[PDB]
Ligand binder design. Structure first.
Ligand SMILES: NC(=O)C1=CN([C@@H]2O[C@H](COP(=O)(O)OP(=O)(O)OC[C@H]3O[C@@H](n4cnc5c(N)ncnc54)[C@H](OP(=O)(O)O)[C@@H]3O)[C@@H](O)[C@H]2O)C=CC1
Ligand code: SF4
Ligand code: SF4
Lengths: 119, 150, 216, 363, 62, 135, 72, 386, 90, 199
């Protein structure tokens, strides 16, 4: 009924099911709600929306299971949440509608002699 | 032998009298440093003999009757700021049980460019710093080319 | 269980003559004749056990790896009760870039063996936990270091890299120093990974002479 | 000079191994604001000089903040001696001062810290001739016609620095919040560990508290912008609140069910603090003394302390001030209440309590 | 971008082993990347860079 | 080998050694006899009949069982069988049971089903000393 | 000047203070020390056409040598 | 596929470098999940960018308790593919120093196990002999721990004159030191009650769990690589094999002590049979020549230049070799492409296999015995995490 | 019972840098001093691998295999443990 | 002794087994049952009144009145050998010229990548270094540099007490290495006069 049986939507549904416990255990009550957390997880999925092998999708889902599981046993401390979860959201909603009228090519030229790499 | 004990104590402490010793600030610091006091009062005062004296004034003693690894010991002249870095290398090998050669029995070859031993300057602002350090006399810009000036 | 202490006297000998001669000259042929379907390629190598003998090496599909291991552990002539380790090698030139390696020890007859399966990045490898308990952590480490998947495993997850580490460092394409470096920030009061930067960049030296014949 | 400071010698993307080509000396670096300022400058790849008066024990935290050879520690600084100051800025084209005092001492008065030393520092900076940016700090509540002696000294020192160095940039932030700040921590030491909390008059005076990391990014932007040289910039949060409102929100944060604050006339507060302020001199200073028990604080609480209309602020820097009432800046103060798992007796917190628990307690 | 090529024989030597001549004998095709910004250490003068793909090709990819 | 206990142990009585090495505790509390090994070998020979007569695996297993049965027949004292087979009787019982258990999986998978022209590449390693040392 | 700082005596000045050495023969052997294993690899240096004014300097140790044997 | 639901029991055993998570229904352990990798230095990938001689010090810091054993396996793996014969005197020296290293590993292991149990005197007492053997190491290689002494085709340097004298002098009283060491725990009811019948392991599980070294010997298993697959001069050596049959911590303790006794016996035998002759393989194209030879000969100078810059080119191939390590069986898998750097070097560590037995062994035990399990396992995370 | 920590001169009497006797360490084989030919002794570059024939239509007579095995306590032969690894004269 | 007893087993499965099965009796390593009043009294003296702690106690007490191996640093040092690999240093020739000729063998051999070398021809035509730096914070003190150098230029000196308060002080340059060599030359030369018979 869906591409490759739609395992991706099942994985997303499972992670969304497990999401609120992460919010309560990691004290994200005063930063986020369930909705925009779900939006974050959704945007994580969009990185590989154009994969054409079911096997690659299966391995992606398995590695995502490992990531969410090491999220579950608190193996990644609050600093991981800071560096990957809520501060990126604050930056995304924070630099909205920037006042720079220059083209990205000209931005790169005014930046340095090489393009920026890494996060 | 009390007289021999006091003679050894005077000749090791470097003072002139027991009154000069017990009233000196070195004795007072010996009342707070147990290692230094042990040097002054126990190890140097036992059976054994002096070996020689370096140009820093430190004294070297050996006791063949002692067990291995504890036959040789040195008294630093600088009673308040004793430091192993001031021992000259020509005594370093005999002190470290690496060779059985000392200036009193071995005539080494002295290079004309030989730099003497002294205390370390670590922790001070006068210590060595790399040429790209802010403490250096003239900062270095290690760019491997010449910039054109109008 | 085998290799029990039987003799109360000192032993000046290693194994028996007939068994050693078979295991060193006709063992590979016995393996070939027994299960030729399980056999795909045969190499008798430098004899892991001892410098003076020969020992075989096995190549096969992942499909029949489990029954082959079962026979190799359970056969009356091949009592390989000790699986030393499971690892893999990267061959980026090949269509299948991975050569998973399986090593066995036979204390019953003082022998050893190597078993290899060649696979690509997207093919499952049935787990050998049901055959050997130790394969669990070896499969875990192999997956962590290369991404080699093992189907049917109880819980296959990283064991050696960082908690949030993505990527397999022992891959040939994986950078020696990587992509990310980690440092503490006073402002955020948190230890954070940052893009990798080096005060002195690594120096690679090309010593390989243009005259060497052994290059392969 | 305009942008050659931040552009000429910039080497690398801007990381720790990168080189910004910027040499600066920060005074009061081991202080609360100066520590974050130095950590912000060096992390972009700049050379930082840190002369200090306090212990090296209190200063070792600054050593980690820079790479090999970019943290300069100058012990035994004497603000009355210009030799150490000349050595401190002998290579830096940027000067930043955060040396500040909140209580008078028998060995240092308000004038000595806030007027003469910055004046001589600016004089020596102009004498150097290679300095491009002189960054000075003051209070938002600084005004020459204030009864508060510290605010008056601050304003006088700002005017003196401006006259001495035309191109120095003046920064006057308000309340600055942080983990080790002098605003929330003393408020906690007054709400807790104390029998009662005095509040000056109605306490409806309006202040605009701000966050330290915004100040650090502000310093970075000020170094980036050339036009800000020779000007005055005021820093404040996106909200205007009174002392009563701040106290109420703090009590909510601490979830204290007992309002221990009291509204008292200013003369009563002065008489409370009169005996310990006439003995402030002839004393080497004492620990565990809040800066709040002074008459100058009372005079501060009788006036509003917010950004002036038309003043140069965060918007001029393209900087949006983050929320101070809540957010990541409020987590450290929440660690007084650890964020709240089982602390206290509170029931009004039933809003955030999980679902099944409230049906267990039937509300 | 990446460069797929085989390095040419060095003029310093008459050796031909590490050349296309023995192509079937040894893997001799290399993948490289454009060099990235590099500078020097202010304190020592050592070459400083941030390239993740600085040497992984010239050392391994054959 | 060397016993670890400070006491003197005769070890010439085989059951005393069996107690020391813990065969009674970890492998088999019951003492293994020649008859049990005979039963196990006969069961293996009966079990191997699921394989086709044309399979070499069946041939090899049959040869091993025949050799073991000849050893059991020609030897009376169980210690003699231990000396011949370089192990203990209980070990051989476990071996025979394992070999019998191996049969059903092999029958279910049948590795002998290969084409008549099935090809096995063979690579052999030759030492340098073969041509270098004295022939 | 690239590596040495101050007015300390340079190695160039040190070696410039050693007069050339007169040795019989046409080829000299330089080891850098009395015992060969403690110095540099042995070097054979030509001595013909060399004088006190124009001697042959060691490429390993910088020591100079000459011989008045080449009919001069 | 799995929720959390029931939190209930939760534990955290140590960030300080073993991390342990356990599961108890009370006072008795039901599950134990170690987490490792806090010492994973990624050496195997790092090996690929180093020459064979360059990568040798990596093997010093894999088991920093036992070093020469770690060197020996890699050296043998290189030499077998290189087809190089080792001289007799070099084999004697290798075996003797390996026995001394095994003695050090046993000493430190038993003392640490005692300190974890609660005995502090043997710790301090045995570290004196450990310092003696460190002095022995420094005399012969100039390093106390990371000697880098073993070389492809022999050793770096010959033994200095007067060393065997002090070796024999040390052996003359090492037995007395061991005897006084035993009396503190051997005849003690407390030590036994702490160690007896804790962590019982079978031969079938051990061969299923890939055990090696003394743990294997305590299960009634007759196995020594030095007697089944001998290397160098171990075949000539005559010594006994301690054998236990309970799989007990006390049994492993006694087995290690008797192993120390046998090591001393082998040390004596090596001391009285030291031969005179070459200590390095005579192949200069692999082995570096003498400095005296280098400084007076063009050919040796050229070989010193080439080997110390590029190194010898191992022929393409593969091999795996293992050594009877004091902590078990230490093996290294070598993959050769034909160049001067090993293409792929996999390292097998016995402690890593032993560490995998915690969950099944710690079942039915108590928190006072987890430390016992770790101590008797004799595990170094340097080899466990590479 | 032997005592730890011997007194002076009973242990490590001479420091390593002051050996009473000069050390003569050989560094070449006397057989190879003047006969320096190498091809007779290049084991490394002379090893061989060969691809044997397709081992498909072979006849493995297990009869001959099991005919060479013993049948009694006697007649049992064991391969002795080698004393040392090969040295080739050095 | 190494014997075992019922109740002295530290478990429950074994304890429950032995109190409900005589399996331990078949084990010879368990101490056999007393058979008379004398043996019963011996067993009671074994269990009660300690008599096992007493021996170790007495041995430790004898250790109390025994000698010690403690040394008084810094006024006493340990024993070391000429082969000791310590602080890297640069050596000269007795006339005063640097031994290092910038053959870069040391940098090539160093697996630590801690050696940075730049060099050119000197004004006199001599081949000398222009930059000679070794990172001690990165140097592993393996001594492979000392093995590779064919002119005995780079040596690990007998100096090992050179810890610094800052990490920058350990970034050794050419000048500091030459200073160290000039300081420690005599000791290094004396050690070489011994090590030459082995190296
Ligand atoms: N909300 C705020 O905190 C506001 C801050 N400011 C300004 O910010 C600056 C720092 O704020 P904060 O850091 O929070 O206050 P701190 O008290 O935390 O910083 C104090 C610093 O001043 C140094 N100092 C003071 N007097 C002397 C002196 N006589 N000689 C040497 N050093 C001296 C201290 O050194 P030591 O540690 O040895 O005392 C310390 O480093 C101050 O100048 C203040 O005026 C302006 C407006 C509001
Ligand atoms: S120290 Fe020695 S090996 Fe290194 S460059 Fe100088 S001469 Fe060559
Ligand atoms: S001792 Fe080792 S790490 Fe140090 S410089 Fe020499 S080769 Fe490099």
């Amino acid at each position: 009924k869906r591409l490759f049986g739609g395992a991706a939507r099942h994985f997303y549904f499972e992670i969304c099911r497990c999401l609120p416990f992460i919010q309560r255990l990691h004290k994200m009550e005063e930063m986020v709600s369930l909705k925009e957390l779900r939006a974050i997880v959704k945007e994580k999925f969009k990185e590989y929306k154009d994969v054409k092998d079911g096997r690659v999708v299966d391995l992606l889902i398995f590695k995502g299971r490992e990531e969410i599981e090491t999220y579950l046993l608190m193996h990644k401390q609050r600093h991981h949440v800071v560096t990957e979860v809520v501060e990126p959201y604050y930056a995304k909603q924070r630099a909205v509608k920037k006042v720079t009228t220059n083209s990205p090519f000209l931005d790169s030229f005014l930046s340095s002699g090489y393009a920026a790499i890494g996060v | 032998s009390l007289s021999g004990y006091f003679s050894r104590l005077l000749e090791a402490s470097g003072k002139k009298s027991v009154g000069s010793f017990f009233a000196s600030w070195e004795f007072g610091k010996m009342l707070v440093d147990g290692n230094l006091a042990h040097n002054v009062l126990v190890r140097a005062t036992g059976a054994g003999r002096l070996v020689g004296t370096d140009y820093n004034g430190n004294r070297y003693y050996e006791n063949e009757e002692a067990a291995y690894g504890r036959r040789r010991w040195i008294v630093y002249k600088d009673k308040f700021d004793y430091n192993p870095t001031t021992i000259p290398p020509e005594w370093h090998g005999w002190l470290n049980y690496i060779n059985d050669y000392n200036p009193t029995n071995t005539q080494f070859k002295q290079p004309t460019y030989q730099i003497e031993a002294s205390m370390t300057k670590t922790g001070t602002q006068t210590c060595y710093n790399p040429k790209g350090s802010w403490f250096s006399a003239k900062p270095r810009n290690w760019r491997k080319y010449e910039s054109w000036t109008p | 269980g085998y290799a029990y202490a039987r003799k109360t006297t000192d032993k000046d000998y290693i194994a028996s003559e007939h068994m050693q001669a078979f295991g060193n000259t006709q063992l590979t042929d016995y393996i070939i004749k027994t299960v030729p379907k399980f056999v795909k390629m045969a190499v008798t190598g430098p004899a892991q056990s001892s410098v003076l003998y020969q020992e075989p090496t096995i190549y096969t599909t992942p499909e029949s790896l489990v029954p082959l291991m079962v026979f190799l552990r359970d056969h009356t002539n091949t009592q390989f009760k000790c699986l030393l380790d499971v690892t893999a090698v990267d061959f980026p030139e090949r269509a299948a870039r991975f050569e998973v390696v399986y090593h066995l020890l036979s204390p019953r007859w003082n022998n050893r063996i190597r078993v290899k399966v060649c696979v690509d990045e997207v093919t499952a490898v049935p787990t050998l936990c049901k055959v050997f308990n130790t394969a669990n952590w070896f499969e875990r480490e192999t997956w962590d270091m290369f991404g080699v998947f093992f189907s049917g495993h109880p819980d296959l997850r990283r064991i050696l890299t960082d908690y949030g580490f993505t990527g397999h460092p022992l891959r040939k394409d994986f950078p020696m120093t990587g992509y990310q470096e980690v440092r503490y920030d006073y402002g955020k009061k948190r230890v954070v990974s940052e893009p990798l930067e080096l005060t002195q960049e690594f120096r690679y030296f090309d010593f390989n002479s243009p005259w060497e014949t052994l290059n392969r | 000079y305009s942008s050659t400071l931040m552009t000429a010698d910039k080497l690398g993307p801007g990381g720790r191994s990168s080189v910004s080509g910027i040499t600066a000396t920060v005074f009061g670096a081991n202080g609360f604001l100066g520590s974050y300022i130095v950590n912000e400058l060096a992390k972009r790849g700049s050379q930082v000089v840190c002369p200090f008066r306090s212990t090296e024990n209190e200063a070792m935290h600054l050593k980690q903040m820079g790479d090999l050879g970019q943290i300069v520690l100058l012990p035994e600084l004497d603000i009355r001696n210009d030799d150490d100051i000349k050595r401190a800025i002998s290579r830096s084209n940027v000067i930043i001062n955060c040396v500040g005092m909140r209580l008078q001492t028998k060995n240092w008065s308000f004038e000595d810290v806030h007027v003469d030393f910055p004046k001589r520092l600016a004089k020596l900076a102009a004498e150097t001739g290679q300095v491009q940016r002189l960054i000075h700090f003051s209070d938002m509540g600084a005004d020459e016609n204030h009864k508060s002696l510290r605010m008056r000294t601050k304003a006088v020192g700002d005017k003196e620095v401006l006259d001495a160095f035309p191109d120095a940039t003046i920064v006057r932030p308000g309340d600055i919040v942080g983990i080790e700040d002098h605003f929330y921590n003393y408020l906690i030491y007054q709400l807790t560990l104390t029998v009662f909390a005095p509040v000056v008059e109605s306490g409806s005076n309006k202040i605009q508290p701000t966050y330290v990391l915004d100040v650090a990014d502000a310093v970075a932007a000020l170094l980036r912008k050339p036009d800000t040289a020779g000007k005055t910039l005021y820093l404040g949060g996106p909200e205007v609140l009174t002392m009563r409102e701040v106290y109420d929100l703090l009590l909510k944060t601490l979830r204290i069910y007992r309002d221990d604050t009291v509204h008292l006339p200013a003369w009563a507060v002065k008489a409370m603090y009169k005996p310990f302020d006439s003995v402030r001199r002839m004393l080497p200073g004492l620990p565990m003394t809040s800066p709040l028990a002074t008459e100058d604080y009372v005079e501060e609480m009788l006036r509003d302390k917010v950004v002036p209309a038309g003043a140069l602020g965060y918007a001029d820097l393209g900087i949006v001030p983050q929320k101070v009432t809540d957010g990541l800046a409020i987590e450290p103060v929440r660690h007084a209440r650890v964020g709240g798992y089982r602390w206290g007796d509170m029931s009004a917190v039933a809003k955030d309590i999980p679902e099944s628990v409230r049906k267990y307690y039937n509300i | 971008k990446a460069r797929i090529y085989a390095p040419a024989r060095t003029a310093s030597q008459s050796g031909l082993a590490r050349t296309v001549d023995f192509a079937t004998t040894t893997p001799a095709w290399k993948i490289e990347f454009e060099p990235t910004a590099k500078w020097q250490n202010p304190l020592m003068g050592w070459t400083s860079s941030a390239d993740p793909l600085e040497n992984v090709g010239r050392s391994a990819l054959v | 080998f060397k016993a670890v206990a400070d006491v003197e142990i005769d070890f010439n009585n085989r059951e005393v050694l069996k107690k020391y090495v813990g065969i009674r505790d970890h492998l088999s509390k019951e003492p293994g006899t020649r008859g049990k090994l005979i039963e196990a070998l006969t069961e293996v020979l009966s079990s191997i009949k699921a394989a086709p007569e044309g399979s070499d695996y069946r041939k090899a297993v049959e040869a091993s069982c025949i050799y073991r049965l000849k050893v059991c027949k020609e030897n009376e004292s169980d210690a003699a069988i231990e000396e011949v087979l370089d192990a203990h009787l209980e070990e051989l019982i476990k071996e025979a049971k394992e070999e019998a258990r191996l049969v059903p999986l092999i029958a279910g998978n049948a590795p002998w089903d290969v084409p008549a022209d099935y090809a096995v590449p063979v690579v052999d390693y030759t030492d340098a000393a073969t041509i270098l040392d004295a022939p | 000047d690239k590596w040495l700082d101050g007015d300390k005596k340079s190695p160039m000045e040190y070696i410039n203070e050693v007069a050339p050495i007169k040795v019989k023969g046409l080829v000299v052997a330089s080891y850098g020390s009395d015992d060969p294993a403690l110095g540099c690899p042995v070097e054979y240096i030509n001595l013909k056409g060399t004088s006190l004014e124009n001697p042959a300097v060691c490429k390993y140790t910088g020591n100079r040598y000459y011989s008045d044997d080449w009919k001069g | 596929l799995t929720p959390a639901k029931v939190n209930n029991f939760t534990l955290n055993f140590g960030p300080q470098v073993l991390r342990l998570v356990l599961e108890m229904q009370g006072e008795i352990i039901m599950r134990a999940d170690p987490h490792i990798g806090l010492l994973h230095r990624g050496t195997e990938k790092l090996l690929e960018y180093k020459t064979y001689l360059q990568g040798l010090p990596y093997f010093d810091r894999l088991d920093y308790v036992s070093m020469m054993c770690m060197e020996h396996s890699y050296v043998l793996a290189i030499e077998q593919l290189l087809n190089v014969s080792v001289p007799l005197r070099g084999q004697y020296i290798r075996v003797l120093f390996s026995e001394i290293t095994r003695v050090l590993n046993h000493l430190l292991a038993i003392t640490c196990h005692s300190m974890d149990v609660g005995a502090l005197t043997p710790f301090l007492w045995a570290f004196e002999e450990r310092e003696k053997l460190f002095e022995f190491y420094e005399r012969v290689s100039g390093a106390r721990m990371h000697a880098a002494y073993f070389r492809v085709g022999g050793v770096s340097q010959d033994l200095p004159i007067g060393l065997l004298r002090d070796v024999y002098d040390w052996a003359r009283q090492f037995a007395s030191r061991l005897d006084e060491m035993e009396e503190l725990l051997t005849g003690n009811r407390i030590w036994k009650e702490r160690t007896v019948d804790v962590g019982t392991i079978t031969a079938q599980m051990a061969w299923d769990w890939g055990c090696s070294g003394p743990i294997l010997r305590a299960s009634g298993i007759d196995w020594d690589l030095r007697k089944t697959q001998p290397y160098d001069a171990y075949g000539k050596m005559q010594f006994n094999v301690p054998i236990a049959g309970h799989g007990d911590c006390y049994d492993r303790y006694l087995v290690r002590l008797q192993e120390m006794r046998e090591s001393l016996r082998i040390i004596y035998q090596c001391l009285n049979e030291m031969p005179d002759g070459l200590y390095k393989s005579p192949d200069g194209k692999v082995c570096p020549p003498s400095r005296s030879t280098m400084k007076q000969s063009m050919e040796a100078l050229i070989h010193h230049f080439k080997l110390y810059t590029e190194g010898f080119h191992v022929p393409a191939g593969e091999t795996y070799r293992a050594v009877e390590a004091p902590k078990g069986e230490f093996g290294v898998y070598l993959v050769s492409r034909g160049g001067n750097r090993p293409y792929r070097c996999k390292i097998r560590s016995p402690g890593y296999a032993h560490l995998q037995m915690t969950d099944v062994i710690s079942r039915g035990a108590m928190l006072a015995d987890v430390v016992t399990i770790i101590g008797t396992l004799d595990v170094v995370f340097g080899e466990i995490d590479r | 019972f032997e005592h730890y920590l011997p007194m002076g001169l009973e242990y490590r009497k001479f420091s390593p840098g002051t050996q009473p006797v000069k050390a003569v360490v050989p560094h070449d084989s006397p057989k190879l001093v003047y006969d320096i030919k190498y091809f007779v002794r290049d084991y490394r570059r002379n090893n061989k691998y060969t691809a044997r024939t397709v081992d498909a239509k072979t006849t493995f007579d297990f009869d001959k295999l099991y005919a060479g095995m013993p049948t009694k306590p006697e007649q049992v032969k064991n391969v002795t443990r080698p004393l040392i690894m090969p040295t080739r004269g050095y | 002794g190494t014997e075992r007893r019922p109740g002295e087993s530290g478990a429950w499965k074994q304890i429950e087994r032995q109190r409900y099965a005589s399996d331990w009796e078949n084990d010879p390593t368990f101490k056999r049952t007393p058979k008379n009043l004398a043996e019963v009294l011996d067993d009671s003296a074994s269990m009660l009144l300690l008599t096992d702690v007493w021996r170790g106690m007495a041995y430790t007490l004898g250790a109390f009145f025994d000698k010690k191996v403690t040394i008084m640093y810094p006024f006493e040092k340990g024993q070391l050998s000429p082969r000791f690999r310590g602080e890297h240093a640069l050596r000269r020739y007795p006339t005063g010229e640097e031994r290092c000729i910038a053959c870069k063998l040391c940098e090539a051999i160093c697996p630590a990548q801690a050696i940075t070398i730049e060099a050119e021809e000197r004004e006199d035509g001599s081949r000398r270094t222009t930059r000679y730096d070794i990172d001690m914070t990165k140097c592993i003190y393996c001594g492979f540099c000392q093995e590779a150098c064919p002119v005995d230029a780079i040596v690990e000196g007998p100096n090992f007490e050179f810890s610094t308060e800052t990490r920058e002080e350990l970034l050794y340059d050419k000048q500091k290495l030459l200073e160290n060599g000039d300081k420690w030359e005599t000791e290094i030369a004396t050690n070489l006069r011994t090590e030459s018979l082995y190296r």
